[PDB]
Structure formats: C-alpha cells, structure tokens
C-alpha cells in the first residue's frame, strides 16, 4: 500500500489544498492508499491526532470494528471522536437508528 500524494476531495497535494488555498498535510488509508487533507475530510485537530494512532480506513474501506465487515454500510456509525466505524446492530445494546446528538464510541468514552 503506497499512499496517494493527492487529496481525493480537492485533488491538491501536500503543498496546496485547492479548497483552502493553503498547503496542508495528507492522511492516507492503510488499506487502499486513498488520501485526503484533514480539512477536506472535515476532521477536527483532535480527530486528526486520533487517526494517526491506528490503521485508519477511508470512507470506502471503513469496516465495523466489531464484526469486521464493510457490508450494510448504511448501518455504520462513524465515531465523532476517532472515526472508527460501528454497525448500529453490532453495538450492545443495539440501536434502531442514528442518535440525534453527537455519538462517540466506547473506546473513546473510556479514555476519560
């Protein structure tokens, strides 16, 4: 897996984010090499930090931490603090629909 040197959303490299007009780093998917500028990915600084501590997956590869599939990807929640994916039906207890408010995962809650 060689990381891409351009952003999937804006097509700029690390020397130019074409949406902000400034240089910006790229983060890259561990599975397929797709890359993006954190701001194009809509990441907070703290989320950018977090995705640097584990094998982050792009929006297309994202698989549920609990069962390991990226199937039923309409049922995946992305944690608001670390971007890990979880099926609503894999959570214990399961939820029928996305919570109205912000939602973060059990791992983030335990940090703390």
């Amino acid at each position: 897996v060689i990381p891409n040197n351009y952003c999937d959303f804006c097509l700029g490299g690390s020397n130019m984010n074409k949406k902000s007009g400034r240089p910006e780093e790229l983060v890259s998917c561990a599975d397929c090499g797709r890359s993006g500028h954190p701001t194009c990915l809509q990441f907070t600084l703290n989320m950018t930090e977090a995705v640097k501590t584990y094998k982050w997956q792009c929006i297309e590869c994202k698989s549920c931490i609990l069962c390991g599939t990226s199937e039923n990807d309409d049922q995946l929640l992305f944690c608001d603090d670390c971007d890990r994916g979880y099926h609503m039906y894999c959570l214990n207890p399961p939820v029928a629909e996305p919570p109205e408010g912000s939602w973060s995962c059990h791992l983030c809650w335990e940090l703390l």
Binding site: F9, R34, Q42, E60, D73, D80, G85, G101
Partner: peptide, 17 residues
C-alpha cells in the same frame, strides 16, 4: 451522529482510483 451517508454528503465526492 454520523453515518457513511452523512460523511459522503459532508465531504463531497472522491476522485476515482
């Protein structure tokens, strides 16, 4: 809460491979 669908809408489309 964020899902794959809200994430895709939030960021816009991705370049092809």
């Amino acid at each position: 809460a964020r899902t794959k669908q809200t994430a895709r809408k939030s960021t816009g489309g991705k370049a092809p491979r």
